Each structure stands twice: as structure tokens, then as C-alpha cells.
From Swiss-Prot:
Binding residues annotated for Zn(2+) 2, in chain numbering: D111, H112, D194, H238
Gene that this sequence comes from: aiiA
Name the UniProt record assigns to this protein: N-acyl homoserine lactonase
Protein species of origin: Bacillus thuringiensis
Quaternary state and interactors: Monomer.
Swiss-Prot/TrEMBL cofactor(s): Zn(2+)
Stated family: Belongs to the metallo-beta-lactamase superfamily.
Keyword terms: Hydrolase, Metal-binding, Zinc
């Protein structure tokens, strides 16, 4: 109870998503799709296992056309098989939903909270501003904001357990949050999540898809201050190049 660090941080592939390249660089003219990774993260901690995000909804399985009839039509195409349903991922890894200590929702976009309905008992940690936006903004799916789950609504920065900190990073979505994790093997790790899809969104401040790009920039600024102080390893949300060098399950950091 001694532990200031998490035992293991796993990067867990949870399917993929086609995004128009204008999502990763808002200046690009639409018309080329990128097959970007979708992630969830598994933390093995002294208090129990913690899952960060829950993949895509069952409606996306074998259904690349999910975003027909919406703003995302032809620009967002989920790449999800039956194997990528979060319960299946978890079962292969070694867990059932009720085994988890917490779920952390970085935000409620379909590629992060599609699986939330699987977890009916586990507290789901989500920002108030994200929860309230999800009750109306139309980039949100029904599946991402089911009414009777055990939500643990928080406001701003928050310590989940020792070694697991949430950093409020709104802009990509109204209540987006990133993670700062201290691991036994690696020390300080910053999971930007979608506060930057790619390394150039972060380092070069290349604009990318978001609810409020001005806020997204300030959140990036704030992360840069944390980086200056902590010098962490930094992992981006939907980065095909960085993915190439990521250690992924069963490897951990
Ligand atoms: Zn998102
Ligand atoms: Zn995302």
C-alpha cells in the first residue's frame, strides 16, 4: 500500500479506424484515409487492475459504414471485428468486467467509450464536462453515454490510485483527459490520448480534429509544461508512425 508506482502498463490494441487525413492535420484537403490504431490500456496496480478506455461499440463490428448519415460519413470508418469487442479482449488477457477496479474514460467518443456498457458495476471515471456534453453533442453515440452505469464523475485533475494521475486536457472533446502514470519499469509516462493524435500535433502544434481547437492548443501547452518538469515517455492517441515502435501486449512498460 507502499506502492507509488503501477506494476505494469500494457498497450492493448482494440481494433482500428479509418480517418481522413484532415483529422490528423486540419490543413490537408480531404480525400485520403489513414488506418489509425485504436487503443485501450491496462494498468496492473497494487489495488487492482485498471482499464483505460473500452474500444468501439458492437454496432461497429463488421460495419465500416457505421458513420453513414452523420458528419463522419466517408471520413470515419471503424475497423472492428468480433475479436476487438472489449469483453473478448479482456477475456483473452485474463479478466472479466467485474474484475476491474476502475474504468477510466479519456473521453466519450465512440472509439474510446463504445465498450462502456459492458461494465455495469465498475466505477467509470469521467470528466463532468465530457459527461454533460455527451448528453447532447452529435459526435456522441447512444452507446457512449448509457444512463445507468456506475459513473464516477470528476472535475479537473485527479489521482485515481498512487501512480495513476489524470490531467484535464479539454479541446479535442469538451472534457477530454490525459494520463500521467508512474511505472515500476519505466518511471514517468504521459499518455496524451487524443490531446494529440500524432507526434506533430504535439511537438509542432499541427491542428487536428477537435471540438475547440483553441482549447486543444492550451491543453497541449499545459502538457508541454508537465513534460518540461517530468521528462516522461510520451505516447500519442492515433499515431501510425509511433505505433511501429510501441511495445504492445504481452509486452509492458
Ligand atoms: Zn476522440
Ligand atoms: Zn480517439
Amino acid at each position: 500500500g507502499h506502492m507509488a508506482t503501477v506494476k505494469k502498463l500494457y498497450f492493448v490494441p482494440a481494433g482500428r479506424c479509418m480517418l481522413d487525413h484532415s483529422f490528423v492535420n486540419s490543413a490537408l484537403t480531404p480525400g485520403k484515409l489513414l488506418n489509425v490504431p485504436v487503443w485501450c490500456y491496462l494498468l496492473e496496480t497494487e489495488e487492482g487492475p485498471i482499464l483505460v478506455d473500452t474500444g468501439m461499440p458492437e454496432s461497429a463490428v463488421n460495419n465500416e459504414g457505421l458513420c453513414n448519415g452523420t458528419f463522419g460519413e466517408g471520413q470515419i470508418l471503424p475497423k472492428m471485428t468480433e475479436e476487438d469487442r472489449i469483453v473478448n479482449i479482456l477475456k483473452r488477457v485474463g479478466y472479466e468486467p467485474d474484475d476491474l477496479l476502475y474504468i477510466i474514460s479519456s473521453h466519450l467518443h465512440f472509439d474510446h467509450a463504445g465498450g462502456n456498457g459492458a461494465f455495469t458495476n465498475t466505477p467509470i471515471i469521467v470528466q463532468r464536462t465530457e459527461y454533460e456534453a455527451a448528453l447532447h453533442r452529435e459526435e456522441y453515440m447512444t452507446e457512449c453515454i448509457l444512463p445507468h452505469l456506475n459513473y464516477k464523475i470528476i472535475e479537473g485533475d485527479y489521482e485515481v490510485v498512487p501512480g495513476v494521475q489524470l490531467l484535464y486536457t479539454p479541446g479535442h472533446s469538451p472534457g477530454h483527459q490525459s494520463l500521467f502514470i508512474e511505472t515500476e519499469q519505466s518511471g514517468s509516462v504521459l499518455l496524451t490520448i487524443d490531446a494529440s493524435y500524432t507526434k506533430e500535433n504535439f511537438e509542432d502544434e499541427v491542428p487536428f480534429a477537435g471540438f475547440d481547437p483553441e482549447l486543444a492548443l492550451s491543453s497541449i501547452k499545459r502538457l508541454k509544461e508537465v513534460v518540461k518538469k517530468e521528462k516522461p515517455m510520451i505516447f500519442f492517441g492515433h499515431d501510425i508512425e509511433q505505433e511501429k515502435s510501441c511495445r504492445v501486449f504481452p509486452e509492458y512498460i
